[PDB]
């Protein structure tokens, strides 16, 4: 029913702490795969944090708040998902003692944490170095960084390629910020089989819809594309259109009219001399015929999302009513119209030998979803940099810097206001630690050394994954988008600050 007092507080903290506990063995280069079972049927074999926590229903309110943190974070940057959860926990946990043990009110611990966040954020931008968003080589060895710790690493280079080759493709600066809608303009397409490398980033689209009529062009050299909303069949009246006939030879009259309007429609289209007509709706058998000899291949039923991406790699602006069909609505700038038959399943291409279609190949419909998600992380950190050319010391280095500059300051602040501040510092340290642990090396040992080396000797010094020894980032490098280090710490400290505002929990609508 009800639970006021530290009772509340505790269960919240423990709850939140437990959330972390699950995916903590998923943060690191040697991170394991949490094969989860969804209710609907299938499975999820991913190790990408947010993709795990999504597939786990929780009860305790805090555990629900803690769980959605991984989502809002997966919405800002594509990466840094697992990290925010672990941090968001350790913060609450590291407050636990001064929260009750040292009887500090939640207002005070909040007043400090909100303060320690800003200072902490400084130390992030302080250690961050900028980068050439255009230097293909830098972007690659940047995207590569956030491809490690995932099944997609055995082709790491191959991945950053398909990543950049797609981030830049749908990009479109615009200024009067840079707009990169990976979502609506980079439709992926996972096709079972082949090899990983056998996957490319076609600059166009790929529909499996075949051709409306047999004897129709399998591939127009340079096709003239015409995209339209409206269907291709005899329309009807949006009023009480009811016909009364007693005039004998009138049946034939009307029944004919239908053929007649389908004709007109074919005309208006055929007019601008098209070779490829792709409509979102249907295609009357009649209309097929008049578009056959009219000289063009037809494609019926294609999703809006599928269509509007075509209209960016054909230029062919989509148009509804045909009696208004302009000639500006061309089909210029569009290579071939291949129709490769991929294992008993016909496809259609529209490459040009603004929106690309990443076509992945692996070894199962299952294995592909691993790739797709892994790729998304790549293609997202690429976008981040595109809109914030700043990077942060990976290997948990940044995380340790903030640990010290804060630890130092806290110790030199004096007042009850110090303890909560001190905790944010002590908290931060958990990431290089989770890393060192999931590496196998001795946490107490490596950290003391990493922390010390940090205290003076440079701040771009994190821990090396497969190794387990402290290395300098600059050295073997593994910087990550500075944006990630923003959110991870922004919302984590917020989460903590929210849950700490709770002193009572109640049940009933």
């Amino acid at each position: 029913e009800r639970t006021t007092g530290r009772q509340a507080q505790i269960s919240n903290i423990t709850a939140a702490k437990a959330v972390a506990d699950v995916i903590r063995t998923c943060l690191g280069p040697k991170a394991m795969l949490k094969m989860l079972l969804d209710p609907m049927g299938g499975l999820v074999l991913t190790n990408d944090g947010h993709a795990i926590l999504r597939e786990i229903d929780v009860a305790h309110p805090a555990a629900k708040s803690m769980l959605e943190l991984s989502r809002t974070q997966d919405e800002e940057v594509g990466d840094g998902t697992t990290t925010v959860i672990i941090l968001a926990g350790e913060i609450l946990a590291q407050c636990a003692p001064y929260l009750i043990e040292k009887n500090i009110h939640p207002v005070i611990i909040i007043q400090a944490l909100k303060k320690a966040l800003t200072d902490a954020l400084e130390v992030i931008k302080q250690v961050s170095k900028p980068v050439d968003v255009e230097n293909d080589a830098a972007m690659k060895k940047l995207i590569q960084a956030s491809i490690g710790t995932k099944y997609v690493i055995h082709w790491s280079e191959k991945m950053c390629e398909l990543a950049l080759d797609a981030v830049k493709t749908v990009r479109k600066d615009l200024g009067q910020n840079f707009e990169i809608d990976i979502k609506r303009y980079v439709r992926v397409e996972k096709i079972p089989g082949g090899d990983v490398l056998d996957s490319r980033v076609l600059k166009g689209v790929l529909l499996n819809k075949d051709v409306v009529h047999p004897k129709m062009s399998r591939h127009i050299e340079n096709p003239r594309v015409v995209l339209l909303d409206c269907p291709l069949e005899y329309k009807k009246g949006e009023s009480q259109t009811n016909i009364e006939i007693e005039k004998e030879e009138d049946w034939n009259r009307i029944l004919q009219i239908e053929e007649e309007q389908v004709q007109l429609m074919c005309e208006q289209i055929l007019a601008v001399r098209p070779t490829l007509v792709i409509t979102e709706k249907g295609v009357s058998d009649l209309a097929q015929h008049y578009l056959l000899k009219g000289g063009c291949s037809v494609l019926r039923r294609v999703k809006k999302s599928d269509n509007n991406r075509i209209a960016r790699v054909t230029g062919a602006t989509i148009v509804n009513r045909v009696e208004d069909l302009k000639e500006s609505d061309v089909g210029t700038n569009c290579g071939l119209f291949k129709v490769e038959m991929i294992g008993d399943e016909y496809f259609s291409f529209l490459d040009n030998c603004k929106a690309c279609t990443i076509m992945l190949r692996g070894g199962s419909k299952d294995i592909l979803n691993e790739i797709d998600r892994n790729l998304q992380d790549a293609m997202a950190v690429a976008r981040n940099v595109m809109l914030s050319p700043s990077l942060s010391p990976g290997g948990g280095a940044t995380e340790m810097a903030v640990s010290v500059k804060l630890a130092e300051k806290a110790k030199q602040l004096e007042g009850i206001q110090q303890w909560p501040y001190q905790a944010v510092a002590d908290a931060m340290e958990c990431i290089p630690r989770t890393l060192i642990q999931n590496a196998g090396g001795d946490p107490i040992r490596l950290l003391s050394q990493l922390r010390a080396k940090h205290a003076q000797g440079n701040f771009t010094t994190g821990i090396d994954g497969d190794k387990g020894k402290i290395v300098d980032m600059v050295s073997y490098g593994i910087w990550e988008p500075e944006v990630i280090k923003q959110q991870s710490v922004k919302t984590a400290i917020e989460s903590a600050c929210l849950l700490l505002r709770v002193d009572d929990i109640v049940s009933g609508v």
Partner: protein, 523 residues
Amino acid sequence: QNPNAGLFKQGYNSYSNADGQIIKSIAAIRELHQMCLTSMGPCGRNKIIVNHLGKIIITNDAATMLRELDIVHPAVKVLVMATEQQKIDMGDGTNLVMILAGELLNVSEKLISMGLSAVEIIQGYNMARKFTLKELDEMVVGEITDKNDKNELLKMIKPVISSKKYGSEDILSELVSEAVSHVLPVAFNVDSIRVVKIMGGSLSNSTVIKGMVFNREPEGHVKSLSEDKKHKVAVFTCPLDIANTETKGTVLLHNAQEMLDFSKGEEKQIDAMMKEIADMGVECIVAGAGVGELALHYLNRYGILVLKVPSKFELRRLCRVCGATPLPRLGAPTPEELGLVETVKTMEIGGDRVTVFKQEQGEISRTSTIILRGATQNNLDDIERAIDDGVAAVKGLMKPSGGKLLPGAGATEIELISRITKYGERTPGLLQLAIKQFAVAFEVVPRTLAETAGLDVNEVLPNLYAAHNDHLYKGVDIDDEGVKDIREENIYDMLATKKFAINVATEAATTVLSIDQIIMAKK
């Protein structure tokens, strides 16, 4: 859908520590810790525990609460065990074993977090413990001169009674130090201080008699004896009547003579047995065994005050009041076996009649009784729990130099923090961590005393700290301004107690860390 593997036993529950079990347990302990953390100190509170058979209980003491509860968590039962050691093997300090054993495991996870091994934290804790017993042997300020002088006793029992029953802290300890002296010779047994209680008035009427009081009545018309010194008394294991034969034993009669004569025959045979003893001067015979009909009848004539006391544990502690000796058979009451009683009358206490057995000087007693008066039966019980707490601590100051003593009010504890840490950053290696933690642990005794006193702990704690670094008397001002001084009130926890505790808490807390897997079964 989900499979399940490696199972062939029966339906148990195995909590592998590699599943963050050590902490699951710290939790369970953490919960019962908060219950004891507010019962310690004079500023402690009580809890009303309601029996699994339905009986009310209210007690400040810790080993008692835990006893009356239905604990179930294996890692918790372990610390409840240590609270037993303390109550049995010391009677006092039961509360401090909990608070530390728990607090040890609390500041213990901080270490486990870093990466410190289980075995490493254990070792460091023991290393810090043995080191902690050393200082206590020398942190010791005064030591009672083993004087055992009644007034010297009140200096010891008073701090034990406060923080259990704070308020009548003196009216109590005085009331017991007076019961103990009456039995302590001139160049100890806890049993020699039987305690009685009865509803009526308040504690201000509580008393101390040089002998026990009994409920039942004198049996014969012999109501209550005289008020002139000395009364010859005879105790009996045997019942007052014609003995019988363990193998059957039926009266047979072949001829009417046998009968007519057997009748009055046994009649006077009883008189015979009675007579002869009444003769040896006796006038009060306490019957641990039954008492025949004719038997008491004759004795009634000889003004022999009787007193059925079947309680073989009462009868024995009774003889040690008068001086008499329990006599297995009946008939040969040697003038040596007999004892002397100054008073053996019947007083009404609280409305009901009870028989007494004291002495006003002559014939000293080795078993006194503390008659506690009260109104609430409940409370009145927690008092008899305090009377035991003190007595237990006195029987402990005996023979092997138990007088030793260090500052109470946690003053000792604060010193112990620094002193254990001294050893902390002094020992090389990573053990230095655990040893330092073991020290922090000792901050519960002070902090809670302040916390329970409504004092802002964040103020009393640093205050009491800087006030400790000649003067390691500064403790927690139970009642004000900053801290206060131990010496300012002649209050301190003797060594024997607080030391044995730290050792039991360190065992408890350590065994809990040695378990790196648990298995249960359906009940």
